[PDB]
Every structure is written in structure tokens, then in C-alpha cells.
Subunit: 333 residues, 3 copies
């Protein structure tokens, strides 16, 4: 049966970008093959040069977004090069059985493995590393991403009418717990293992030191702001593998939102802010109507503006005065 | 076009009360004009006399609830008197473009401005001050409120049948982060700026020192409890501009609840407790069936009973023994 | 009227098990009688022997799950034996009036009382102790449980088709705040009152020291793991009386989920993780398709793996290679 199915190999791209795919399936079920290489590496996460030992899927935080269609088979080749120091694995919330695949994918440095699973449920799901005994440590070190399982006939609104996006971006939100000395300065370590004991004590406080989008404070700002034009329909996939978040587009809305990200449910309309539970991926669809800069944020404003959970959208086009206008510009009373 | 539309000026009232309005629109689209004056002031928030420098819209925490209808134009005159010390602005989650209006409304003490925007989406939305660089500081100092955009044909249940309320109250929940000395005593400052540096360190802990309704511990209790009678339909609008909350009516329920507050979505039925994400306004409809005192609370009971997030409802009418009755009064076994 | 109704006495069972009942009602409305005895007792909650003074309904944390049908009358006999030291009461989120029954059930040691209320709304609700002035202290000491009010015609899916479970388990999640000395070691007390002053300071930090299922770290693991077989439909009721949680079945899904637990609302489909607000009970239905061990967790992984919020399911049956298969077992590259 599977033997007889067609197979296509897909090369992943770095977040916030997403690999090429079809919204409405043009072929029947296929075996979609992906390859990911584990990369343990130092990463500076803020302006002051705070550095951590990140554990990544394909060298990025978050790992890349995989896109398949309902009932396709996902075949993943997972490589943990001998240059790494730790055992890793992968658990797909999209899969059924063996702890999401975690129990079948344990690879020590120098090993690899190939897992195949059927994508039976449509929606956006989280995938993350989950080694027995050190699950939270690998997850909060950036070892998580997401997979989107699109219905074979694309997205639909509450009335069952088609929703087609022109652009799609993937925003992975990460809570970090950097160990601190007595005065409050962040510690630095030589290897991941040296950090272990302190990492556990930092996590138990339940208070992140940094909460960032795309691995660093300001990663999606300035020259890295997301782009769009007035009239474009944009799908924004957002995931949080460990902690709740409440996304919000400042100056816009979520026209159609699947906060818990499962496509068989009708979306919520006209959201100002929505809650994505830790351990979940959600998706929001919006059509831009005004040009300018928009701030995309986690709406606990301390987490957004003090801790790092803030990004930008720069949109081009003509301003619509009917929607909004400054009647009297700021001036002395 | 707008030139030709009718205009009505509306005078706002202090929370928990709401200005007069029509549920079902009796006229066509109009330009609804409001005026708000910024007021920086000292406020004692608890029983022990803890005082803070609050930043308010119209002298209240939360700012007043504005009520308009879908497709009306909101025209707001914002005044920042020379007696204030800081730059302020306003961002409406109900608006589209220019950061909700924040980029078009920056006024220094002694200035004013007039913004107009089209209320294209029905629901309850949060509005708050958001000056570049000090967003969380102004929000957590009490500078936020809410606006309700009613469908032109009023509220409806899941089956599309009319829902008419007899009374409406606005509950604004506020998380405060008062700086403390080494022993745990709250600090006091002369002006807002003197508090700044310490305020930022207090906010970064992510742990509020006070979480109150209507600006103070016990503000909606005793002689200030909300009132109703058995048989009355009450709509309770609740907003939290920065942090999640989980409202609950002790002794009652939320018969119809729009937790994320957007009216084009059908409401949830028979809720015991519901989650309102930080940065959102929600609404719950309930018909009183028993008289007596009801406690309206944030259901994290530590936040409610230790931190200040608790209010009362005193309802008049006849007791219904079918619904509830004490069969055997408390007595010695 | 009530005089003329039939009455049945029901003996409760210890969580995670649930007393015998009918899904679809076979008789008309009845008076369902229950008896609960309050038990103040020492409980060791972790591996290191940390001990607390738990306040329980029927000797368990959480208290037992009561199951009735819509429009039945619940008659509860509450006994507070002279061996206890504190005043207690009970508030049912399922009831209407008198603070959920809290104002009608205040019993000092040596007293008892009988309350009756009509179960007018279908769903799973939380019930908990709530004495004026010490509400959070009794709740976070384990004094809470849940009651399920089933529609007279059983459970239904989004299309109104019947959902019948073969097994049902009750998971009560509890956040504990154990007082600590300067070095971080947990304190020990002789009686509940001796703990009081310190308990309040510990709660105000808003950071639990332990978050457990069924009263202790590892309570639902090893020989106490929940059981099922491939093909069985299982209903998992989960409650959190004070704090938000985000349940997740590792290796599975929530096929039908009522996150806020009210049955008149259609369930959410294919959830990976769902949010249950503090002060709420929810229910998830799932059909097992793969055998093996599944971890049932609160998806804030620090709370699950470091703090104690983790349990197991051991499922028997044949492995399905179509759903998942290891193509290449872990081996040297
Ligand atoms: Cu790993
Ligand atoms: Cu997971
Ligand atoms: Cu301001
Ligand atoms: Cu905002
Ligand atoms: Cu008690
Ligand atoms: Cu309660």
C-alpha cells in the first residue's frame, strides 16, 4: 500500500518563512519526506549580549514549519551529529502513539533514525524534543517547532466558504529562563551540561527572564519586520510549546482565528486578542486595510515590551481616511 | 459623505455605570462625539493607605465605557492639560490603522487632538494609552478602559433570537505592581517620574502586588455593591488590558458569555467561569433567580481574596426553595 | 411535589474512579442523596516526604466526583466531626443562590447539615469549601472536588449524534503553596492553625511549590496508572479550583473536548492541548488507537515534570503500523 504511494522530498526553510506548498491538494495522498539535523549551539538572545546554549532542530529557534495535507504520511529522517553532546528525540503532537514518536526516536550524538506517521487530523500542531527526565530543559532551550496539516480542500470560514491566503508566516514564541547570580546578572557556561543544575533551579521559579519571537529580542524588527501590502490576505501561525501567550496585532484584528489551531472547528471572528495555551499552535487570518507599521505582540505588555515578545509588520499601500483620520493634529490647547 | 451625517455629543459617566444608549439602533449611522481629559493623580488603592500615581482617562480607573453602534464613526477629543507631567496617547483595539490611533494621538501636557475612526466590527474592545517606550508603565498605572460596539440590531443568542438587558455594568480589572523596600513595605513617591525606575523593576517580576476592580480593594463592596432584582437581565462587561483573568459569579452563572467579547460569534452557554485573555474585553449576560449577596470574583482565589479582585452584587426579591433549600440547618450531630 | 419524587442513595468512590451511574436517564427526575464527611489530615505530597495538613471531603484530594442528571435534586448531608479543628462549608458551582450553598452550610466541628439544590444546568462543575475570610486557604489545602450533571439523554457530538463512553476517570489537579525557610526547605507544622500565618505569605507569591494530580507527585503512575484498551472510548474529567491548567495526552488527542465543561455547547474537535480556567471543570473524550504508555500532563512542562502535574495511561492492544512506524531504528550514521 504505502509502497505504491508517490513520494516527494521537501527542503525546509528558516522561520518566519515557510516552504512552498499547495493550499488545495492537487494530487492524492503521498509520503512527504523531510530531513532535520540537530544543532546544539550558542545563541545571544538580547542587546546586552546574553548568551545561552540553544538546542535546535535545523539550527533555528523555533525549528522549521512542516506543511503537509490530511492523510499524507510524514516520513522524517532525524540526524544527531557526533558534534553534539546530548541525546535528543522528537514528539509530534500531530501523531498518534509512542508518545508522539518520542519513544521511537531517541538518538545519541552520531546516530540517526527515520520515523513515519499518518497525519490523520487537520490543524497546526507543536512538535518538540522530549527525552525522559529532561523534557522541560530541552523544550525551554529552544527545541521545538510546528507542523501544519491542511485539509485536502484548503481553509474555510464559518459558513464553509474558501479562505485563501496570499502570504504565510510562522512565529515561534520562546520563554527562556537564564540563571542569575546574587546581583541579578545572567550567568554564562562553557557547555550545555555545565548549565544543567542551574537551569533546573531557574525553571522552578516559573518566571522567564526572556520571552522572544524567532529566538531573540528584536528578531522580527527593523530590517527583519514581516511584510505585506494593503489588500493581501495573511495567515500567521503562532506556537508556544510550554507557556500560554495572547497574540495581538496592534492596529489590526484577527478576522478569522483558530486559537487552538484545529481546522475542523469553525474559526472565531473579529478577535482583538486570543489565547494560545502552552503546548499549542494556533493560526490567525487577516486582510490588511491600512498601510504603515503594525506591532505584533503577546498582549501581556510587560512580556511584550520589557521581556522581548514583540515584532513588526510593515505594510505598503494607500491610506484610507474613511477607516481612520486625524481630524485635529496634536496642538496647544 | 461624513459631512452629511448626523452628529450627537455624548457625556460619559463614571464606572461601573454606563452612559445612556439604545440597544437596537433607532437612527442610521452617525458621528458620535466624545471628549476625554487626561488626569495624572494620586490614588490610595488599599486599606493600609498604599498610594500610587495613577494615570487616568477622565479621572477614573478604568476610564469610562463608550457605547456606539456598528458603522458609526467615533470622534474623540483628547485633552492633556498643562497640569500633567507626561506625554500620553490612545490606542483603540476597535480601530483599524496607525497602531489603533496611538501614532496619531501623541499629546504633551497642554495639547489636545481629535481622532475619528469607523467602528467596523461589533463587540467590546479595550482602549489604552501606549506611548513608545513606556507602554506597560502607562497601562499598569490604570490608563485603560473599554468601548462597546453594538450590532445595529442588538444582542442575540446562539439561535439568533434577541437578548435584551435591563441593566449594564462595567467592571475594569487592574493589576498593579507597587515597588517594595527590602522588608516588603510599599514605597511612596512625589511625582510619576520619581517612580519610573523602580516601577520597571517591579513589573519585570511579573507578580502584581494588587489586582483590583474599579481602582481599589473593596471598591465594589458595601455601599458600592452592584444592584439588581430577581428577574432582571444584567449584562456585565469586564476588561483586562494586560493580564488574564477568569471571572465568576458566586451563586450564579454566565447564561450567555462572549469570553473574547466579539458579537458576531455565538455566545457560550451556562458558564461557571470563563477566561478573558490580557488585552481583551468580554461580556456575560445573566438573569437573576435568587435574592441575596453574590460575590463577583476573578477565580484564582488568591488574586480575589488576598490581592483585591472581588466585588459584590446585592439582589432583591423572593427566595425560591425549589432551586435551593436548607433541609437541615447546621446543628450538633 | 418533591415529597412525591423517588429517592436513591448513592455511595461515593475514591478518585480517579467514579461511582456507578447511567449515561442516558432510565427514570424521571429523582432526589439523589449523598453523604460526605470532612477530614482534616496530614498528607505527604512528594518523594522527599514533604507533609502538609490537608482539608478534605471524604478523606481524598480531590473530593469524590458526584454524578446526577439534569433536573434531579441533589441532597447532600455534610458532616464535620468533632475531631476536626476548623469551620468548613461547601459551595457548588452547579447550584443557584446563597453563594452556591456556602452561606447555608457552615458547620463547626461536631455539627452537620443537609442542603438540597436543583441541578438546572448540564455540565461538569467545581465544588469547594469557602468559609468567609479563609477561602483560598481551604481551597489550596485540597478542599475541592467536582460534580457532573449529565443531560437526560447523554452526551452528543457537534452534529447531535450520541457519544457513549466505556470508561470514565476523574483527575483533580491541585496547586499547593508549602511555606519555606530561608534556605528553601519546606516547613512542618503540628496543627492546621499553626500553619495559617505562613500559608498566607506563601500564597501571596502566586507561585505554587507543588502542582499534583490526585493529591501527590506520582499518584497516577506506576501501579496507579489509568488503564484502557485499544478501541475503548474514555471520558476524562479534569478540574482546577484555583488556577489555570492546559491538559494534554502525550501520544493522543482530545477527539471531543468541552474545555469549559458545559454540555449545551458543542465540543471542540481534535485538540492537542486545551485550557481549563482556574475555578472550572472540563471534559475530554478520546478513543484509543495505539497500545502503550501515554503521559497525561499539564502542558506547561515545568509544572508537569518539575512540579508534579503528570500521570500515566497504560493501554493494551495491537500496534497499528499504518498510524505510526519506525522505518529506521536509531543507529550509528
Ligand atoms: Cu533535545
Ligand atoms: Cu508535548
Ligand atoms: Cu499615558
Ligand atoms: Cu493593546
Ligand atoms: Cu474547609
Ligand atoms: Cu468557586
Amino acid at each position: 500500500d504505502i509502497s505504491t504511494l508517490p513520494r516527494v522530498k521537501v527542503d525546509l526553510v528558516k522561520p518566519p518563512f515557510v516552504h512552498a506548498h499547495d493550499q488545495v491538494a492537487k494530487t492524492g495522498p503521498r509520503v512527504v519526506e523531510f530531513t532535520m539535523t540537530i544543532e546544539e549551539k550558542k545563541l545571544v538572545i538580547d542587546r546586552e549580549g546574553t548568551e545561552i546554549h540553544a538546542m535546535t532542530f535545523n539550527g533555528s529557534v523555533p525549528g522549521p514549519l512542516m506543511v503537509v495535507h490530511e492523510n499524507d504520511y510524514v516520513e522524517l529522517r532525524l540526524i544527531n551529529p557526533d558534534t553534539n553532546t546530548l541525546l535528543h528525540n522528537i514528539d509530534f503532537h500531530a501523531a498518534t502513539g509512542a508518545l508522539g514518536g518520542g519513544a521511537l526516536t531517541q538518538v545519541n550524538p552520531g546516530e540517526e533514525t527515520t520515523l513515519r506517521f499518518k497525519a490523520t487530523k487537520p490543524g497546526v500542531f507543536v512538535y518538540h524534543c522530549a527525552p525522559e527526565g529532561m523534557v522541560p530543559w530541552h523544550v525551554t532551550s529552544g527545541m521545538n517547532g510546528a507542523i501544519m496539516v491542511l485539509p485536502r480542500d484548503g481553509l474555510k470560514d464559518e459558513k464553509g466558504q474558501p479562505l485563501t491566503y496570499d502570504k504565510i508566516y510562522y512565529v515561534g514564541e520562546q520563554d527562556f529562563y537564564v540563571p542569575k547570580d546574587e546581583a541579578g546578572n545572567y550567568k554564562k557556561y562553557e557547555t550545555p551540561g555545565e548549565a544543567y543544575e542551574d537551569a533546573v533551579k531557574a525553571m522552578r521559579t516559573l518566571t522567564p527572564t526572556h520571552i522572544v519571537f524567532n529566538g531573540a529580542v528584536g528578531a522580527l524588527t527593523g530590517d527583519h519586520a514581516l511584510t505585506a501590502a494593503v489588500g493581501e490576505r495573511v495567515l500567521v501561525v503562532h506556537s508556544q510549546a510550554n507557556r500560554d501567550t495572547r497574540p495581538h496585532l496592534i492596529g489590526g484584528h484577527g478576522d478569522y482565528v483558530w486559537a487552538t489551531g484545529k481546522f475542523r472547528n469553525p474559526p472565531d471572528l473579529d478577535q482583538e486578542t486570543w489565547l494560545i495555551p502552552g503546548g499549542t499552535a494556533g493560526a490567525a487570518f487577516y486582510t490588511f486595510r491600512q498601510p504603515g507599521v503594525y506591532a505584533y505582540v503577546n498582549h501581556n505588555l510587560i512580556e511584550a515590551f520589557e521581556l522581548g515578545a514583540a515584532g513588526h509588520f510593515k505594510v505598503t499601500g494607500e491610506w484610507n481616511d474613511d477607516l481612520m483620520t486625524s481630524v485635529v493634529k496634536p496642538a496647544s490647547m
